[PDB]
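Notebook B, p. 112. Complex prediction, attempt 2.
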Amino acid sequence: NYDTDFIFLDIESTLGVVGTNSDIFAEQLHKLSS
Amino acid sequence: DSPVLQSAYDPSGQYLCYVTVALDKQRVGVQPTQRATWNENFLYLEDSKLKVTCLKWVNDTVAIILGMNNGEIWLYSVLANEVTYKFTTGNSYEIKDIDLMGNQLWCIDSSDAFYQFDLLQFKLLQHFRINNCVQLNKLTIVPAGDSVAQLLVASHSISLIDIEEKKVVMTFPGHVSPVSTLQVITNEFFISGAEGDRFLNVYDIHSGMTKCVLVAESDIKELSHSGQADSIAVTTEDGSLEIFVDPLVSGNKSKKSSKKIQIVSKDGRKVPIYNAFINKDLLNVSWLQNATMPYFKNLQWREIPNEYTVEISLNWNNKNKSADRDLHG
Amino acid sequence: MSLWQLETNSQQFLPRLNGIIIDCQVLGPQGNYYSLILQMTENNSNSDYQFLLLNASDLTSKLS
Amino acid sequence: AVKDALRLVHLPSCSVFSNWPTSGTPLGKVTSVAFSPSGGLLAVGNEQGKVRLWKLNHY
Amino acid sequence: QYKLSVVSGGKPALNNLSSVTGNKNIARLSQDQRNYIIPFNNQIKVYSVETRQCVK
Amino acid sequence: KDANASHPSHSAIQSLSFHPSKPLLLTGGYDKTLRIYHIDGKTNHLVTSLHLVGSPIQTCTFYTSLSNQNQQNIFTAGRRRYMHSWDLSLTAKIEKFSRLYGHESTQRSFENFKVAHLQNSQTNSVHGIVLLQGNNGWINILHSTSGLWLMGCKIEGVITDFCIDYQPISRGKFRTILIAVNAYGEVWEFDLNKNGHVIRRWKDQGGVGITKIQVGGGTTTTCPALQISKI
Amino acid sequence: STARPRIITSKAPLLPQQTTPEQRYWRQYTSAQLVKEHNSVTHISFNPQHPHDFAVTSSTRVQIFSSRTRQVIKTFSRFKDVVYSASFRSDGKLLCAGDATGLVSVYDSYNPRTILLSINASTHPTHVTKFHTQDNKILATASDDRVTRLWDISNAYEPQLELTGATDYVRTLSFIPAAPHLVATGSYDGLIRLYDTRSSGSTPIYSLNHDQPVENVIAVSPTQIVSCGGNNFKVWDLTSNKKLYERGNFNKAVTCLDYVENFDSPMQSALIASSLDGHVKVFDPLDNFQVKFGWKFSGPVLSCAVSPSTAQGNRHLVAGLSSGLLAIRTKKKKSNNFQRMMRGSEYQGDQEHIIHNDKVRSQRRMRAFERNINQFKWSEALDNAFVPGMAKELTLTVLQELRKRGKVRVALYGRDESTLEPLLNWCLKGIEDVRSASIVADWVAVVLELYGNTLESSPVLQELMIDLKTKVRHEIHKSKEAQRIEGMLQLLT
Amino acid sequence: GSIKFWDFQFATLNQSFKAHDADVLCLTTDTDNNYVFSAGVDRKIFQFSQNTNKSQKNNRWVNSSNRLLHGNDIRAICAYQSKGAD
RNA sequence: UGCGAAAGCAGUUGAAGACAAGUGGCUUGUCGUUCGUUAAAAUGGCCU
């Protein structure tokens, strides 16, 4: 590929590359309103 | 006009409680003002003609006190979804304003009566009424620590009240119309603003003298002050926000707004701001994106320009791009 | 992919599915998705399967 | 088919309400109607493109 | 200064058994059926059926 | 206040339905758009608005299932061979039903539909059905999520209208009855929780040009039950 | 799932002399009209402004034709001798005509009875009269006096400028289309002179030596002008005084030119040229004045014109011949209650938030062979091939689709004598062409492979096989002799 | 080509099958009505069965089978069923 | 099947076991059987 890497294709097609209070209220409200 | 009948922030501006009508019955909902920290369940008023006349965040199981129009203060926890306790006066008169200091709730009545309740005891402590104050629609506790002396009551004309003597100790020239905001700024000043006028005035609570007059350029709906008196952000009738930066300094007798913020969409449609919140360097504005669902925005208000126009993305003619189909159908 | 209405023996088809159907099954609780395995046998040198579910409403390939 | 042709018949008594709609109700040419499931509330859509809305105070 | 890696995925790799007709599709839907869990020969892909993107 | 006064309609308002739970009113007409309004007393505002091009709509219905009451579909249809189904999510994901699964000759227009609930009656699993009024005497009932043709009920005459009745049986089991009227006045009732078989056939006393039947006093398609024990 | 791919019509490699876009556009100028005039049509001008009428100068009359009926709407007959030139003003309001007695007479157009003024020019015949193209109130008349004159039409007694200097028979004017002080005149000695009118005017600022006696000079750009005379035309850059193209694609002398710009055409500009041998040709100024189309007429063509750049209607090419006739080729171009009930059907989603679009586009109608190949009726597809009204490429593409797709034999199985005769009777015609003959070869080979007994029984396809044999004999003599020509010019490399 | 089954009381259709491609000239049944055979000008003989206990308790015929045996048409069909003849 | 060029050039096609049919064997044919060799058909066709 055109930015100094080489891609290769494995026979099982893996492409590889060789390169170079309120807090508890908030938590319980996001619980109870979901 | 706005569907949101009543709305108020918690202190620190993290949640917004708002009462809107839903097909002839009031409903009270709470939204977080930033999701990065929907809430689809409301308190439903079950009567078609019972409605909320005022609301106040308590400060620690978090709750709202909703002053109704049948002589009741409902106390409603928000994590659960029930009114936990129903304060009641002896009457059927609608209640015009409430406040609390610590655990000591105070409220005013349409028969110009003062009631005191104790949130720690769930009891009506005091009931009285004072002469020459006869059209009351606001009260505000002047803070002096755990002592809850000196109420500050408005009827178009603010009056300072000592509660040990149940009598009036100062009389402020109010407005020509009923007072709609009445809030204590420092330990020596309070701001007030009336219905249908664009003039706040800050009075000296020790002498009676008006320090200054603050001039919005549209009729004021709500106000918020930062906790150290250094900034006051009012929101007006035309959906704009106006920030008075450092209003309590020496534009000498009457001060204009320093900054003005309005929101337009990508189209040109101007959405209205209702009920913003300001603090140190942080300003949270609210609007309704769809018909009744509140959306919020945080702003560093000190570094924006004066005439600031927030842009929001809002659906106006956008082709329904389905994710399971390319653009050619 | 044909689906046989077993009451009247009536087929509904979906005809050009870029691979032969080597497995098909209904998927949802109400059966709103069909999941299919398409074997794509124009190349004989490899067994290359495409996994394709599709919503049963308009028979459009939701998440191939 | 004609203008203002809407009636609300009370039942079990099977008797039409005689005080509404009047001659000045802007019903229009009533081409749809809907009842609210909770509020006791009529919506009446006419051929001009207007949904008119009424609330029945019994509910 | 050159290094080798495997960076991109492979085949989906269903049940490669004989004598199983019908269910050879080992991919699953969620119970709140918003994301679709398919194995590969290199990883478990979790796509999302609403946006068609791989989310994990 | 007039509900669509905030955003005017560009056609006669052909159908109109409230939401089963939320304060929403859906209007729709021959200008091939459908609008949802948050209604209240004072300020009936417009929630959202979807313009289906080339598809004028004649019937539009809020459907909300009985199992989880969390779907909130809108089924809409006009004089077309398809029917749209918008899934409410507050872009907009709508699907199109356009396959009668072998029965396209008896259903040439999706105008008169009604949405109802049906129980499996071997599981206690309910699902929505849409019911299409076709040409000969036919009512084509099909699934509201998969669009599969479930059954069909043919009356003898000119089918003019139909309605859906429900009757409870036990704890958590009910039965769906389709009530379809000839133009002449004779009424069929089909039990359709089993195969779509007639259980009663009666005749309207008087009545010669029959346009519209409706039931009421319990759960209709316009007063729908949110919970299966409230049927 | 996809949609079904359409059956692709078999296109071969393209043969030489294909139909260019320029010649398709210029070939749809048809429905020729031939109007016999009293004498040779010498000049023809068009109305500029509503560019929809044209004046034809025959002998001793000028006829304005309309560009929608092609009949003479109006006519100007009160000339004493042969009228020579007739042009419209740039506002299209009045019409000047130079006459053989040296009397320029300018009428108003569309009113032949009000002669507006009669300039008495030279005693010699006045052969070209045209108004300025920038200015409105000056008229340039050249005559057989070897001197052109600029006349202010207010002061029509003495000419406001007298452009002399040419040695023989000035026959053409032209104005330069951005500088209004610049008049290029052309004479029968060659030598396009051109004059700055702020100067003396008795001397040109320079001269362009067309070697032949020029017949016309027109201006294409503000910079380049084209002069025709003799067998060629030349183009001249005017800022550099210098020739840059010359096309000599005629047999006899180019009589006239005119030019078109910006009109609805693949050609963005077009210069057409009329040349005394029958031909009028169109040259494209953007690729080096190459010829793109031409018309041949029934005699020597003396003058030509086309509809102007803004014609907006029926568009015309007119050519007047020296034979005395005129050839025009044109290219052409429930209840209020019910509506209130069915109001909304024209709305198309303007104020609406989301706009959904899934109406599929309606594609082209399928032909019977294509839907039979779709329905897998392969013998019916062959039958639908051999109907009479089928295009030759359509018969070829359904043969090729049955060849590639399935089986020739499947398409040919259930046949007999009466149902094979269409195939073989088309194979007679298809064996001649290069593009069909491979398919014709294998289809005939398969049908004689699996119908060799019907060959014995029926005598009335034996004769069809014999005719096919003589056809392949002629074609194999042709395909052998083509290889001989191929060798005999391979020898000449 | 359609073959329809009608409930006699209530005089109304139970189910319709789209069986043949052209007309259905003749159709017949067996003794206990577990099968209905049918035939016409498209020259196939269709068999509609209700023999399953679920078919008998649900009154649901299925389009069981289909045979191509005749050359041109079938204009007459009949059935006999006895102890040594069916 | 191997080498090839798209032409062509060299190589073929065994054994075991089980089962089915026909007349315990014999014949014939199969194999979701093994070892070795580089080695045509169930009226059954494509969506809106």
